[PDB]
A and B are shown apart, each in its own frame.
Chain A
């Protein structure tokens, strides 16, 4: 439902159910959100702006782990947990219209939203990662539907 339909699925669903799908990307930072897709677009442009020392500052590499349970990202070098989000608390994931390599997802804290912003090591990877997040939403949904009689 407004999530990734099956013909766009990048993974055998088993890789989101019995395991996670793990990617690396640059982390640009997380931003608190007042509230469209304006939200993601606005936050993406701001977070990129914050990361420009112009040249870009040496932003950390994170490992993003995606399953039907939700999303975790940790520092790729240090391995410390930056955030673990249950999938129910994730509203959406989207690409930056201005830089298609950049992508974000939004979580529900409290009573405010946070937008977590990343830049893939490739534009192709930004598509694949967003598609994976999309698929994880749909797989979680399908598992939940079948759970209750």
Chain B
């Protein structure tokens, strides 16, 4: 399923 990491973290 869906998973997204935050580049600003």
Q: Is the CB of B8 within 8 A of A92?
A: no
Which residue of the partner chain, among A108, A137, A140, contacts B4 with CB atoms under 8 Å? A137
Q: Mark A87-120, 1 if CB is under 8 A from B, else 0.
A: 1111111111100100100001000000000000
Report A-chain residues with C-beta under 8 Å of the C-beta of B1: 94-97, 100
Report A-chain residues with C-beta under 8 Å of the C-beta of B7: 1-3, 137-138, 141
A4 contacts the other chain (CB 8 A)? yes
For the complex, count residues of B whose C-beta is within 8 A of A.
9
Report A-chain residues with C-beta under 8 Å of the C-beta of B5: 1-3, 91-92, 137
Question: Which of A18-26, A52-60, A126-134 makes up part of the contact surface?
Answer: A126-134
Report how far A91 CA is from B7 CA in the complex, Å: 8
A50 contacts the other chain (CB 8 A)? no
A40 contacts the other chain (CB 8 A)? yes
Report how far A3 CA is from B3 CA in the complex, Å: 8
Which single residue of chain A is at the shortest CB-CB distance from B5?
A: A2
Q: Is the CB of B6 within 8 A of A92?
A: yes
